[PDB]
Amino acid sequence: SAVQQKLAALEKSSGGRLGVALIDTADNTQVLYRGDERFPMCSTSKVMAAAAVLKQSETQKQLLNQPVEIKPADLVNYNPIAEKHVNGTMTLAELSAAALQYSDNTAMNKLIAQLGGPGGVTAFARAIGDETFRLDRTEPTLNTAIPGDPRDTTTPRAMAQTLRQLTLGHALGETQRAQLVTWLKGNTTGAASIRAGLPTSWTVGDKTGSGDYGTTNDIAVIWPQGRAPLVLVTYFTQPQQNAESRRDVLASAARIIAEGL
């Protein structure tokens, strides 16, 4: 189709490998580009860890208010929010917000710990029907994004379906789903990625990710004004280990998708 030819051309112009999955919830139609290829998730995996903790809170009603101590040993490479609370506590809610809206890596590791390790995050994916997601490592090593390495990868199709279920479906309870949506809508790191290729009037909730090999990702739920929501996953990775991020590719892919809906 037209859109797939334009995405292929964008990919060729970029020098990297692009994966796109769009779900239009109006008719459950899907647009896929390298939809079943594995890509390193990098920080887009934080959505799954936060959602897993939200799922736990359906039974442990007070869980999100549980204080968690931030110690200096906990700090890793990128901790914009946790840094502000060293030798203090953050609640699991605050850690989830930090992981999602600021991509805080210490926050992510605390969420993984709460779930009993990366295997606990993966288990949640399996429990909601995602047989593709795999989280193998903690921060920061899950971002190595080595070509061919299946660790810490998913496919665009799988992540689009899972993101749909978490935000628009009923994989989570009503209060949990609403909280997740509120967190995603408040993301602070996405202005140059999917959001930049979309009409300014559309409401977007997203989670970016970046890693080695110039890996540049964004996953989004999109609420166009007067139109059913869309789920859009854009993954991009490059052949050079030290390649620079290419958020413009994600913006361009979103623009190409937006042309036609």
User: Which positions ≥6 away from 90 have C-beta within 8 Å?
Assistant: 67, 68, 70, 81, 82, 98, 107, 110
With 0-12 / 13-18 / 19 or more C-beta atoms within 10 angstroms meaning exposed / middle / buried, residue 72 is exposed
Identify whether the C-beta of residue 111 lies closer than 8 Å to the C-beta of residue 95.
Answer: yes
Cα(75)–Cα(54) distance, rounded to whole angstroms?
23
Going by C-alpha positions, the residue among 166, 192, 191 that lies closest to residue 47 is 166
Q: Classify burial at 56, counting beta carbons within 10 Å of its beta carbon; exposed 0-12, middle 13-18, buried 19 or more.
A: middle
Residue among 186, 191, 183, 195 at smallest CA distance from 255: 195
The architecture in CATH of the region 1-261 reads: 3-Layer(aba) Sandwich (3.40)
H or E element, residue 208: strand 203-211
Enclosing H/E stretch for 10: helix 2-14
- Three-state DSSP class for 123? helix
The dihedral sign for the CA sequence 198, 186, 73, 52: negative
What stretches of 15-155 show up as alpha helix (H) in DSSP?
46-56, 92-101, 105-114, 118-127
Sheet (strand 230-237) strand order: 29-33, 17-24, 230-237, 215-223, 203-211
This PDB structure is determined at a resolution in Å of 1.6
Q: What is the DSSP letter of 236?
A: E
Cβ-contact 100, 208 below 8 angstroms = no
CB-CB contact of 82 with 74 (8 Å): yes
Question: Which burial class, exposed, middle or buried, applies to 169 when counting CB atoms under 10 A from its CB (0-12, 13-18, 19+)?
Answer: middle
Two tokens, residue 71: 């110690």
> CA dist 19 to 4, 83, 139, 157, 204, Å?
11, 34, 23, 9, 19
Residues comprising the chain, all counted: 261
**Is residue 228 exposed (0-12), middle (13-18) or buried (19+ Cβ within 10 Å)?**
middle
Q: Between β-strands 39-40 and 153-154, what pairing exists: parallel, antiparallel or unpaired? A: antiparallel
| Helix/strand/coil percentages in the chain, nearest 5 | 45, 20, 40
Residues classed as catalytic? 43
Reduce the DSSP state of residue 188 to 3 states and report it: coil
Task: Residue 92: name the closest of 80, 75, 109 by CA.
Answer: 109
